[PDB]
Every structure is written in structure tokens, then in C-alpha cells.
Design a protein around this ligand. Structure first.
Ligand SMILES: CCN1CCN(C(=O)N[C@@H](C(=O)N[C@H](C(=O)O)[C@@H]2N[C@@H](C(=O)O)C(C)(C)S2)c2ccccc2)C(=O)C1=O
Length: 260
């Protein structure tokens, strides 16, 4: 189609590998570019960890208020929120918000521990019908993004469908779904990614991700004014282990998609 030629041209100009999946919920049509190729998820995996804990709270009603201790040994490479609470506690609600809105890696590792390890996060994906998602490691090594390594990857198509289920579908209870949407809408790291390619009046909730090999990701749910919402996943990775992030590529892909 027209959009796919423009995405192919964008990919060629960037020197990397681009994966795009759009779901238009108005008629359930999809637009895919390398939709079935695996990409390193990096921090976009945090949405699945937060959703898995939300699912647990449907039965354990007070789980989100449970205090979790933050020790100096818990800190990893990027902990903007957890560092403000060392030798104190954060609730599972606060850790989920930190993981999602600030991409806090200590918060992610606590969520993984709550679920019993990476296998517990992956299990939740399987339980909602995602047979592609796999989480294999904790932070920060899940971001190595080595070419061809299947660990900690998903495909654009699978992540788009799963993100739709979590935010617009009924994979979660009503209160949990609204909480997830609220968290995504308050993301602080996405201003230069998908958001930058879309009209300023559109409401976006997103989760970015970045890692080695210049890996630059963003997954988003989009509420256009007076129109059915869209789900957009943009994954991008590069051949050089030390390549710079290319958030502009994600913005350009979103702009190309929004022209339709
Ligand atoms: C060999 C082990 N290893 C493999 C590579 N690696 C990473 O790729 N860490 C990455 C990391 O920890 N990224 C953080 C994360 O995993 O939420 C934050 N998420 C990014 C995002 O949402 O776009 C951020 C840029 C807001 S930082 C990282 C990416 C770019 C620049 C610095 C750090 C590591 O930190 C690491 O220790």
C-alpha cells in the first residue's frame, strides 16, 4: 500500500530495522510493517509486568497498597524514583507507576519479583492469549538487544494486540484497566517518540523503551478527538552495538501512519 512504501523508505533512510503495527479499533483493520519479526522489547516490557500485578489485585484487593522495601542493594542502573525512597518503602502501586511513567528499573525488578520471576510475567502474557511475548531476564540485562537473540523479544503484531486487550479490551477488570490507562497517559518519557509525530490535540498513553544496538521503541494507545482509538507499536533497532537512539524515527513512523 501507500503507507507501507513510505515506511519502507523511512527504514531505508535510517539504516536500521523498523517494525510497526497499527490497530484501528474503528473497523479492526491493521497496518503491519515487519509485523511478525522479533524485536528486543527493552523497557516496553514494563507494561506487561505492571498489568500482571494489576491482574493479581483483582483477587487480592489490597495488593496495590502493600509496602515493599527499597534497599541499596536493590538499585540498578536507572532508578530515578526508587532512589528517592532508599531505606524506605514504596507500595506496589507506586512501583508500578514508577516503572511505567519514569521507566524505573528498580521498580521493574520489584514487580518481576512479586510475580515470581520473569517466568511469572511471561505466564500472564500466555494467560491473555499472547504466545509471542517472552521475558527471560531482569533489569538491566534484558536490554542487551543482541541481533538474533530471541530472549526478551516480541513482535509488533503481538504487542499491538496485547496492548489493545489490556487498555481497550477486558483482559483486566474495570478498575484495573482504568488504572493502567491513567498510568500510561501520565508517561513522562515519550515526548520525542510517537507523540511527536501526532496532532497535539490527540491524547496518547505510551511506554518507551531503549537499549543497546540503538534500540528505540514506543508502544502507545491513541485517542483521536471524535474518532475511535488506535493502538500503535513502533520498534526500531540498528546494526552497531553503540548506535545512538533514534526517537525521531518513531515520530516519523507515527506521522506516516497518521496521514491515513
Ligand atoms: C550489559 C548489561 N546492560 C545492557 C545494555 N543496557 C541498556 O540498554 N540500558 C538502557 C536502560 O536502562 N533504559 C531504561 C529502562 O530500561 O527502563 C530507561 N528506559 C529508556 C526509555 O524509556 O526510552 C530511557 C532512555 C528513558 S532509560 C539504556 C538505554 C539508553 C541509554 C542508557 C541506558 C544496560 O543498562 C546494561 O546494563
Amino acid at each position: 500500500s501507500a503507507v507501507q512504501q513510505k515506511l519502507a523508505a523511512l527504514e531505508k533512510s535510517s539504516g536500521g530495522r523498523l517494525g510497526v503495527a497499527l490497530i484501528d479499533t474503528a473497523d479492526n483493520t491493521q497496518v503491519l510493517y515487519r509485523g511478525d519479526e522479533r524485536f528486543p522489547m527493552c523497557s516496553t516490557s514494563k507494561v506487561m509486568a505492571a498489568a500482571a500485578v494489576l491482574k493479581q489485585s483483582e483477587t487480592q484487593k489490597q495488593l496495590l497498597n502493600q509496602p515493599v522495601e527499597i534497599k541499596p542493594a536493590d538499585l540498578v542502573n536507572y532508578n530515578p524514583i526508587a532512589e528517592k525512597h532508599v531505606n524506605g518503602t514504596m507500595t506496589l502501586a507506586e512501583l508500578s507507576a514508577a516503572a511505567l511513567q519514569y521507566s524505573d528499573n528498580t521498580a521493574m525488578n520489584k514487580l518481576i519479583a512479586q510475580l515470581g520471576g520473569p517466568g511469572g510475567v511471561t505466564a500472564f502474557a500466555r494467560a491473555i492469549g499472547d504466545e509471542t511475548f517472552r521475558l527471560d531476564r531482569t533489569e538491566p540485562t534484558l536490554n542487551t538487544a543482541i541481533p538474533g537473540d530471541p530472549r526478551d523479544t516480541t513482535t509488533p503484531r503481538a504487542m499491538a494486540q496485547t496492548l489493545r486487550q489490556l487498555t481497550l479490551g477486558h483482559a483486566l477488570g474495570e478498575t484495573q484497566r482504568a488504572q493502567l490507562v491513567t498510568w500510561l497517559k501520565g508517561n513522562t518519557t515519550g515526548a520525542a517518540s510517537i507523540r511527536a509525530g501526532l496532532p497535539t490535540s490527540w491524547t496518547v498513553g505510551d511506554k518507551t523503551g531503549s537499549g543497546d544496538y540503538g534500540t528505540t521503541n514506543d508502544i502507545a494507545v491513541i485517542w483521536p478527538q471524535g474518532r475511535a482509538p488506535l493502538v500503535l507499536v513502533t520498534y526500531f533497532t540498528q546494526p552497531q552495538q553503540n548506535a545512538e537512539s533514534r526517537r525521531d524515527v518513531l515520530a516519523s513512523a507515527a506521522r506516516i501512519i497518521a496521514e491515513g
